[PDB]
Amino acid sequence: MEFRMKVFKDVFTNDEVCSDSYVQQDPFEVPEFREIAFEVKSNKRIKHVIDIVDSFQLTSTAFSKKEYSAYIKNYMQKVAKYLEEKKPDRVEIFKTKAQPFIKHILTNFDDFEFYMGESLDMEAGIIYSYYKGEEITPRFVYISDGLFEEKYLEHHHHH
Predict the structure, then answer these.
(1) Where does it primarily localize?
(2) CATH number for the domain that contains residue 64
(3) Displacement of CA 137 from its chain's centroid (Å)
(4) Which residues precede chain breaks (C–N over 2.5 Å) in the chain?
């Protein structure tokens, strides 16, 4: 029996933070944002918890708007640096397309919750989540250039 799954890992910690079990969508329904980020819908998982958070062992962290600004600046440079070395064809697109995205987050700062990976590394990728309208479960947003994809085809379930 063969098992298939594509996972998404932080390029610094290698933590799994998402999978292809979750359909991707434009962050905040903004097509322009899709170039450097993607959004997925979470659901309730019974003993209830959020499937995304539970499945990938994420942990919510508290940011003040100032603390986050400090973080995101360093992280963007950290990721851009990574791109220069590992994926240079993404360097300018990342820098360019991230501007409106980060501003939208800051501008709507109070709407967001923030999560760390299993490594709890405050220097790595932060997973964003917010509630759309009156929806009961949150939606999670990922900065995709801080991630890499890894396909798995095993004779046992992936863990």
Answers:
(1) cytoplasm
(2) 2.170.150.10
(3) 17
(4) 47
